[PDB]
Amino acid sequence: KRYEKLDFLGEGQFATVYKARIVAIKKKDGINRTALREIKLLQELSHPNIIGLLDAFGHKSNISLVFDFMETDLEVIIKDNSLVLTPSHIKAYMLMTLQGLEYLHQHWILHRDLKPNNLLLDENGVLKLADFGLAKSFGSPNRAYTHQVVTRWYRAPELLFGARMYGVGVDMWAVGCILAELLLRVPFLPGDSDLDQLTRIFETLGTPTEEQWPDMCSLPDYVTFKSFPGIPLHHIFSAAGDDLLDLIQGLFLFNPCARITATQALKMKYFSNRPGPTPGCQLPRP
Amino acid sequence: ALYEYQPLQIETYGPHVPELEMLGRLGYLNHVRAASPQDLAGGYTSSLACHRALQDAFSGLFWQP
Amino acid sequence: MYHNSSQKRHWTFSSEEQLARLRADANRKFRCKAVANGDPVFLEPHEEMTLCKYYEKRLLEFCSVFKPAMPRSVVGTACMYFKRFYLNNSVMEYHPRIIMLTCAFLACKVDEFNVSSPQFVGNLRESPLGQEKALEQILEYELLLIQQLNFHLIVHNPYRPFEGFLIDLKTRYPILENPEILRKTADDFLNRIALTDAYLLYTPSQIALTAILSSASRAGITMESYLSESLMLKENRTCLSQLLDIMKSMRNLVKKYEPPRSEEVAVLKQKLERCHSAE
Numbered sequence: 272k273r274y275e276k277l278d279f280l281g282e283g284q285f286a287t288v289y290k291a292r293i294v295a296i297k298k299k300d301g302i303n304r305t306a307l308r309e310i311k312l313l314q315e316l317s318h319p320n321i322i323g324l325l326d327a328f329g330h331k332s333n334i335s336l337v338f339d340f341m342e343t344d345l346e347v348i349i350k351d352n353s354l355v356l357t358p359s360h361i362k363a364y365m366l367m368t369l370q371g372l373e374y375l376h377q378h379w380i381l382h383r384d385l386k387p388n389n390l391l392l393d394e395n396g397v398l399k400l401a402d403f404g405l406a407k408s409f410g411s412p413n414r415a416y417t418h419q420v421v422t423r424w425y426r427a428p429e430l431l432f433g434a435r436m437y438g439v440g441v442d443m444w445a446v447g448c449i450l451a452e453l454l455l456r457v458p459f460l461p462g463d464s465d466l467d468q469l470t471r472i473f474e475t476l477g478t479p480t481e482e483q484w485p486d487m488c489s490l491p492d493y494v495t496f497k498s499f500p501g502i503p504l505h506h507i508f509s510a511a512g513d514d515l516l517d518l519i520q521g522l523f524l525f526n527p528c529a530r531i532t533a534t535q536a537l538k539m540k541y542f543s544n545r546p547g548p549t550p551g552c553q554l555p556r557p
Numbered sequence: 558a559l560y561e562y563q564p565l566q567i568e569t570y571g572p573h574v575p576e577l578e579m580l581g582r583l584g585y586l587n588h589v590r591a592a593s594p595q596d597l598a599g600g601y602t603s604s605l606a607c608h609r610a611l612q613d614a615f616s617g618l619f620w621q622p
Numbered sequence: 623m624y625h626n627s628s629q630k631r632h633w634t635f636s637s638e639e640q641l642a643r644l645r646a647d648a649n650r651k652f653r654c655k656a657v658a659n660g661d662p663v664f665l666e667p668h669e670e671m672t673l674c675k676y677y678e679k680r681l682l683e684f685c686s687v688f689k690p691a692m693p694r695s696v697v698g699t700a701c702m703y704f705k706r707f708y709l710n711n712s713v714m715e716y717h718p719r720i721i722m723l724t725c726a727f728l729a730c731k732v733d734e735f736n737v738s739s740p741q742f743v744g745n746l747r748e749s750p751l752g753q754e755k756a757l758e759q760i761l762e763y764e765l766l767l768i769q770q771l772n773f774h775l776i777v778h779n780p781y782r783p784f785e786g787f788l789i790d791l792k793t794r795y796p797i798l799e800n801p802e803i804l805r806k807t808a809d810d811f812l813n814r815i816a817l818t819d820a821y822l823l824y825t826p827s828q829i830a831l832t833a834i835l836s837s838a839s840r841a842g843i844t845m846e847s848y849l850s851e852s853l854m855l856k857e858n859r860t861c862l863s864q865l866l867d868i869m870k871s872m873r874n875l876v877k878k879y880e881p882p883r884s885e886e887v888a889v890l891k892q893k894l895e896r897c898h899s900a901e
């Protein structure tokens with residue numbers, strides 16, 4: 272078409288990504304359902320913190336999706352030991368993520384694949400949610416759902432307990448895990464299995480009771496663990512202020528309903544406290 | 558340089574939809590299906606379905622092409 | 623959401639005259655291409671409309687007997703796909719029988735109604751060789767249909783707005799004590815609204831409200847107070863008049879709709895097969 276391919280950007284199980292002219296092109300069933308999901312959802316959304324689908328083109332049963340080219344992602348930022356993630360940088364990343372998520376949720380769509388490598392940063396420091404191949408619309412009681420969504424390290428306890436129906440809590444828990452990774456520069460709960468993930472969650476945060484999570488025992492894959500006391504949040508993050516601890520606690524509530532929404536998190540005093548979020552131009556780059 | 562929350566102002570071209578946390582107060586939730594304990598444990602409430610239905614009912618009602 | 627959707631932005635048109643202009647332009651462009659490539663064979667735009675109505679009804683029947691049970695959202699999305707495709711394409715270039723099946727296939731994909739290709743084509747009353755040929759045609763035309771929809775796949779149906787309006791009536795309009803008995807009739811009118819061009823001319827909320835109030839009028843219930851008082855339109859008199867005229871125009875579209883005649887359908891079908899065989 273009108274795009275000349277400059278560089279090969281990467282290859283996953285889904286498709287391959289190329290830097291083309293700047294845009295990024297992602298290469299009997301027919302057209303791939305993940306690509307159709309991305310197309311249909313991104314054509315109905317328009318926000319500076321959500322990746323924009325510029326154009327789609329293909330041949331036969333193949334298809335190629337054109338997005339804006341994004342310089343890096345949060346995974347590379349976290350894994351880069353040569354840059355310091357100041358509280359202002361963390362606040363800025365958190366704010367852009369939550370604004371994109373607020374727009375996404377008010378249009379009744381869950382990302383369901385939130386992780387540092389799905390949070391892309393452009394040359395202007397503008398964070399955008401990307402990889403909507405697992406995103407789905409929520410709010411329909413008739414709609415069926417799958418509990419095996421979100422990468423395990425960032426998966427919520429309701430998902431790890433087999434919750435079919437869920438709301439924005441899955442994205443909020445992934446957001447809390449991303450914030451914890453930003454603070455610790457390493458994955459928060461790096462389980463090697465679903466049981467190991469749940470065990471690490473209950474070790475770091477405590478085993479939830481009938482009081483912190485009323486109908487938790489009603490989930491299908493629920494398995495009772497030992498009464499882990501849980502490390503206090505101010506000991507895990509020793510360089511976190513009380514406002515940041517409140518934000519973390521809200522993001523990491525075992526009750527998904529009580530877990531703070533994107534709007535409530537944005538209204539949190541942490542985001543209005545000093546210092547303000549770093550301007551996108553001054554955010555660190557690898 | 559501090560951040561102040563500003564609500565997202567997107568025109569709906571229709572009647573005002575009551576806020577999510579007010580629906581039960583206003584009697585809407587007595588006309589929707591009650592959420593199950595399984596759905597509640599995962600963070601799903603009947604308030605979400607009722608709010609979505611009301612927003613879609615009121616979306617673009619006053620709009621003309 | 624509809625209020626910032628692609629359906630509102632690009633696929634809600636000002637008047638039926640614009641729709642007729644689009645269809646006539648498609649017919650003229652196909653005729654020009656056929657003439658340049660190298661007669662009573664060509665169909666007229668009204669004949670194309672008759673065929674499109676017949677094949678939209680065929681798509682309805684296909685989606686109705688589909689197994690496993692197809693959600694009404696998928697059916698609405700597929701029918702809207704059919705309407706949009708043949709707004710800008712001639713039935714003599716792409717056969718409506720294949721295009722409607724491709725619309726159903728794409729709609730099942732888009733609305734996350736997970737169905738495999740073999741069980742999709744098993745619903746056809748065709749031999750297995752014919753089913754495999756139809757599957758090959760559907761896979762060939764899937765990208766074409768997506769391209770002709772301008773990659774606007776999310777379709778806002780009037781069903782959820784209808785449910786929301788019923789909730790609002792049950793909550794805030796005690797004068798209509800039981801809105802539930804208004805459903806079956808308001809659904810029926812809704813289906814009739816689907817057969818016309820209204821889905822390309824009005825919002826899903828307007829369509830749902832018009833169906834509900836047509837059911838109310840058929841029930842002898844005058845609920846203009848719901849518009850003026852409950853929906854707060856007594857403040858904006860012009861808005862109330864505009865909405866009432868929208869509903870009146872929708873009722874006019876429904877009352878003047880003509881179902882395709884069987885004899886004309888058969889004649890135009892022979893003509894269309896002639897067009898596809900000659901080409």
Ligand SMILES: CC(C)c1cnn2c(NCc3ccccc3)cc(N[C@H]3CNC[C@H]3O)nc12
Pocket residue numbers: 280281282283288295296297322338339340341342343344347391401402
């Ligand atoms: C919207 C989407 C299609 C997009 C837009 N830009 N972009 C880039 N640019 C470069 C880059 C380099 C490192 C980290 C993030 C980004 C890469 C990529 N995928 C690669 C990289 N990580 C593993 C592979 O999948 N996808 C995209």
